[PDB]
């Protein structure tokens, strides 16, 4: 009913869409494609079956047709896998493919029948009698456009005889070097003529990739009778224009104009929208004129078009295809259903206080090492419902638990932070997560030792209390110790918390303590006045803030790392980096421990101690970052630091620099 159907434009498929429609409306070819015995073939790797699928859906679908399995099928998936090849290469790919799959069937030899033409490449000597000929079969013709006005002129140029003169002489076997002519002449022109215009070429010294938008004309009706060796009455070489393929403007948007019926009723096929157009919009408007411009044309022989554009109906398609493809469509329908179910649920990752114990770095834990209890939960389900689900699964009373969602902060520290169960209990999980795809929540419980007895998690005044996390630094062992969390009124003076810090650390009451806010990695700010409220003591006080404390003792000074400040500083600089020998390909390399604040001299000196060698006999190479492999050489008067060099490495990605000896 609703006219013609379009293709979707999926990524950088590009000219593929334009080309498919052009082949689909070559009806003789299409009917033959429907005959290919594909019932035994692989669904997503059979190019013949994939192309059959596209044609079937082009013929039947109300919705634009996908090339999801087809692009996979012939193996050009990535954005530029197309940009690599030209249209004519894709044409021979698909045509050769179906041609060979029809061998052993009733529709064998359809592709030569429709597209094969014959041409002679010849050389003939002037003075001596010698000739050298070459009979060649073509499935298309490439026509030059620069210097030209119309396609008639490009055909005059293509048949043009070339003169072999002084210093270009032709060596004709025994006769030797002689003056000669070299010509190209067409023996036959097929029912379907593909003409590729040389709009753009990879001509360097001007540009690796380019475009020629200069004006270039082509007719509705093309007479070729004069460019053939042989002519025959009732079969002239008069051709009707069938298709016009177009590009505009880097790449740019591809679109195609066809008159499927051969009756001059043209349509603009721009991917998913098809529309009717005038002949001007198909031909006149795509000549150049300096934008949008025609790069490939398809003509059909005036006698042959009744055959070539045979009417096609549903029946011309075997039930072997109909039923198979319809089952594929049911499958895809399930897959769509599965996918939309999976989109409705979210993943909540619960972490418990045990996971915080023993962590030696900044923040609560290590992202790569932490162990979660995970829950699939409806995105639109309630908080209270999840709290019951958690309490049932985990084995707790709801009044003995509290959820603190892990909130990633502005300065790049991830920490537990408050949720008001009282006010936010009725909201959805997905809105409460602010769409964090996997929800990460810290689960506070009552000390299980007290759980048996009368023990509920205490009241938390969301306006006037804060939850802080405590960490004890030991200089002697240069280690961190998680000392749990506490609730406290904000108005509390830091001093009033010292007794409990001492106690959790196993220190003696009235032990003299140095306190720091662990703010951010490499930022460990000393709390200088203990007699002020938490509010004044910390800057920007917040649930999930961390205080690190240590004994104030002369003995600290004898350690490598006397303070928690120095500890965290060292933790932030200490970097292990892999050194790979550039001269040994597939070298895994060897790791060295360095500091992000090391200069060239220090880096080289250090690696040279490891390789027995002189630093002057090491040449290092800069990283290309996300692209693997060595980059430009590292000059020995490089001013920056190891930090500056490694900044293109991704966080989870391990670091490596390439080098060589001298």
């Amino acid at each position: 009913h609703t006219g013609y159907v379009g293709l979707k434009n999926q990524g950088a498929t590009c000219y593929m869409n334009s080309l498919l429609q052009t082949l689909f409306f070559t009806n003789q070819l299409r009917k033959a494609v429907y005959m290919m015995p594909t019932e035994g073939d692989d669904s997503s790797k059979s190019v013949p079956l994939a192309l059959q699928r596209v044609f079937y859906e082009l013929q039947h679908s109300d919705k634009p047709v996908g090339t999801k399995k087809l692009t996979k099928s012939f193996g050009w998936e990535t954005l530029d896998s197309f940009m690599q090849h030209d249209v004519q290469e894709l044409c021979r790919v698909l045509l050769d493919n179906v041609e060979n799959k029809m061998k052993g069937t009733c529709v064998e030899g359809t592709i030569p029948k429709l597209f094969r033409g014959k041409m002679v490449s010849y050389i003939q000597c002037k003075e001596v009698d010698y000739r050298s000929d070459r009979r060649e079969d073509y499935y298309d013709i490439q026509l030059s456009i620069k210097g030209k006005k119309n396609i008639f002129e490009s055909f005059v140029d293509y048949v043009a005889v070339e003169q072999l003169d002084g210093d270009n002489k032709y060596d004709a076997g025994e006769h030797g070097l002689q003056e000669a002519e070299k010509g190209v002449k067409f023996l036959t022109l097929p029912p379907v003529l593909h003409l590729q215009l040389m709009r753009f070429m990879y001509d360097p010294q001007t540009d690796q990739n380019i475009k020629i938008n200069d004006r270039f004309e082509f007719p509705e009706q093309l007479p070729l009778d004069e460019f053939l060796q042989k002519t025959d009455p009732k079969d002239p070489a008069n051709y009707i224009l069938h298709a016009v393929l177009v590009h505009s403007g880097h790449g740019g948007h591809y679109v195609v104009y066809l008159n499927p019926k051969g009756d001059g009723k043209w349509c603009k096929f721009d991917d998913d929208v098809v529309s009717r157009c005038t002949k001007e919009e198909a031909i006149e408007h795509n000549y150049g004129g300096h934008c949008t411009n025609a790069y490939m044309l398809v003509y059909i022989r005036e006698s042959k078009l009744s055959e070539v554009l045979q009417a096609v109906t549903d029946h011309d398609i075997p039930q072997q295809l109909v039923e198979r493809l319809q089952e594929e469509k049911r499958i895809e329908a399930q897959k769509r259903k599965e996918r939309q179910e999976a989109h409705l649920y979210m993943q909540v990752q619960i972490v418990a206080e045990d996971q915080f114990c023993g962590h030696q770095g900044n923040d609560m834990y290590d992202e790569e090492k932490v162990k979660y209890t995970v829950f699939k939960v409806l995105k639109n389900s309630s908080l209270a419902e999840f709290v019951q689900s958690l309490s049932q699964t985990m084995g707790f009373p709801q009044d003995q638990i509290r959820l603190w969602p892990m909130q990633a902060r502005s300065n790049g520290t991830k920490r537990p932070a408050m949720l008001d169960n009282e006010a936010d209990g009725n909201k959805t999980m997905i809105e409460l997560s602010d769409n964090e795809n996997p929800w990460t929540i810290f689960l506070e419980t009552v000390d299980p030792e007290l759980a048996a007895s009368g023990a509920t998690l205490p009241k938390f005044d969301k306006d006037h209390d804060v939850m802080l996390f405590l960490k004890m630094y030991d200089p002697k062992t240069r280690s961190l110790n998680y000392c749990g969390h506490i609730y406290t009124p904000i108005s509390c003076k830091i001093r009033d918390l010292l007794p409990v810090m001492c106690d959790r650390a196993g220190f003696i009451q009235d032990t003299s303590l140095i306190l720091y806010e662990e703010v951010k990695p490499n930022l460990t700010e000393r709390i200088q006045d203990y007699d002020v409220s938490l509010d004044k003591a910390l800057d920007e006080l917040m649930d999930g803030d961390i205080i690190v404390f240590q004994k104030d003792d002369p003995e600290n000074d004898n350690s490598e790392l006397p303070t928690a400040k120095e500890y965290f500083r060292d933790l932030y600089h200490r970097v292990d980096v892999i050194f790979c020998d550039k001269t040994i390909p597939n070298d895994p390399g060897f790791v060295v421990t360095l500091s992000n604040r090391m200069n060239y001299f220090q880096v080289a000196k250090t690696v040279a101690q490891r390789l027995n060698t002189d630093p002057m006999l090491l040449q290092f190479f800069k990283s290309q970052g996300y692209r693997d492999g060595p980059g430009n050489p590292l000059r020995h008067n490089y001013e920056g630091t190891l930090r500056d060099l490694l900044q293109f490495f991704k966080p989870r990605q391990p670091k490596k620099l390439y080098y060589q000896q001298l």
Side-chain angles (χ1 to χ4, degrees), residues 86-88 140-146 148-151 154-155 193-201 212 214-219 222 241 243-246 283 286-288 293-299:
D86 51 32
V87 177
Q88 63 218 280
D140 55 17
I141 296 167
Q142 297 125 27
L143 296 172
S144 187
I145 67 96
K146 71 199 195 297
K148 306 295 186 309
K149 292 166 218 301
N150 60 36
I151 64 153
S154 306
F155 263 97
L193 176 63
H194 288 339
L195 304 172
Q196 295 91 8
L197 288 45
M198 325 332 301
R199 268 292 173 192
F200 38 42
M201 320 145 306
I212 310 163
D214 289 305
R215 200 197 179 198
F216 184 70
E217 300 165 318
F218 50 86
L222 175 58
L241 181 71
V244 173
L245 285 76
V246 180
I283 65 103
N286 298 334
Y287 289 159
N293 68 166
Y295 62 77
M296 178 186 164
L297 314 177
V298 179
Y299 290 76

Side-chain angles (χ1 to χ4, degrees), residues 154-170:
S154 306
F155 263 97
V156 168
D157 188 74
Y158 199 97
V159 301
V161 177
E162 190 185 304
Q163 295 301 308
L164 310 173
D165 75 337
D167 298 35
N168 311 353
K169 301 294 197 87
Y170 175 69

Side-chain angles (χ1 to χ4, degrees), residues 253-395:
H253 193 13
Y254 300 80
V255 165
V256 68
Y257 291 89
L258 268 67
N259 63 167
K261 300 288 183 62
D263 71 343
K265 289 179 146 203
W266 290 81
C267 294
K268 180 179 197 153
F269 297 82
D270 175 10
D271 305 346
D272 63 325
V273 312
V274 189
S275 67
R276 176 157 281 91
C277 67
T278 62
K279 287 176 196 169
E280 286 97 315
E281 285 162 328
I283 65 103
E284 304 292 355
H285 282 56
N286 298 334
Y287 289 159
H290 183 104
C291 184
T292 54
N293 68 166
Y295 62 77
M296 178 186 164
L297 314 177
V298 179
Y299 290 76
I300 294 173
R301 197 178 189 110
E302 186 164 26
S303 53
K304 302 277 179 185
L305 67 74
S306 54
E307 185 196 334
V308 176
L309 313 175
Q310 271 158 64
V312 187
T313 302
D314 323 349
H315 310 298
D316 297 284
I317 313 185
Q319 279 291 314
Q320 177 160 116
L321 261 62
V322 170
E323 296 173 303
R324 165 163 208 179
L325 293 180
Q326 277 168 15
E327 184 68 344
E328 282 179 18
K329 276 193 278 179
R330 276 187 211 86
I331 288 162
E332 304 324 313
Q334 278 292 79
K335 296 278 189 298
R336 290 208 70 79
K337 185 60 182 156
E338 321 295 359
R339 287 158 64 230
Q340 275 156 30
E341 290 314 314
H343 186 33
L344 197 154
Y345 296 169
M346 66 179 307
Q347 296 296 100
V348 174
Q349 297 186 141
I350 291 284
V351 56
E353 198 160 31
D354 52 33
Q355 297 302 314
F356 305 175
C357 298
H359 176 97
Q360 295 306 278
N362 288 115
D363 286 25
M364 302 299 111
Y365 55 57
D366 182 325
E367 195 59 66
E368 302 305 318
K369 304 196 194 93
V370 67
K371 305 177 193 201
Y372 296 117
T373 300
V374 182
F375 295 84
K376 69 174 166 65
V377 59
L378 271 77
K379 280 174 170 170
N380 57 359
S381 62
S382 92
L383 180 44
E385 286 172 325
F386 174 63
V387 186
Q388 186 137 52
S389 187
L390 187 69
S391 46
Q392 208 287 306
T393 311
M394 298 286 196

Side-chain angles (χ1 to χ4, degrees), residues 90-110:
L90 190 49
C91 197
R92 274 184 303 164
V93 168
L94 271 51
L95 289 184
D96 296 353
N97 172 237
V98 301
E99 186 187 346
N100 65 44
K101 186 61 200 293
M102 293 178 301
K103 299 184 184 172
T105 82
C106 56
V107 296
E108 180 170 341
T110 299

Side-chain angles (χ1 to χ4, degrees), residues 23-71:
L23 295 162
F24 174 73
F25 293 115
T26 323
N27 295 13
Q28 180 157 26
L29 173 57
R30 197 213 304 173
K31 292 172 95 192
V33 162
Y34 293 138
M35 304 303 162
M36 290 189 288
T38 55
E39 186 265 359
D41 304 352
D42 296 343
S43 172
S44 183
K45 305 206 307 308
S46 171
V47 188
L49 178 59
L51 199 144
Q52 280 178 338
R53 192 190 295 111
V54 173
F55 283 3
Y56 171 72
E57 286 286 280
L58 276 180
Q59 203 173 296
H60 284 98
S61 192
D62 194 353
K63 184 172 183 190
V65 179
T67 51
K68 302 180 277 275
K69 295 177 189 176
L70 182 49
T71 46

Side-chain angles (χ1 to χ4, degrees), residues 411-429:
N411 56 220
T413 45
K414 191 170 177 156
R415 309 275 195 95
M418 195 193 75
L419 206 73
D420 186 16
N421 179 60
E422 188 262 339
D424 299 351
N426 287 282
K427 291 162 69 187
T428 65
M429 292 290 288

Side-chain angles (χ1 to χ4, degrees), residues 395-409:
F396 289 88
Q398 295 186 195
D399 63 24
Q400 299 190 335
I401 67 174
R402 190 154 287 122
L403 273 57
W404 298 82
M406 298 295 299
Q407 214 62 30
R409 293 198 196 184

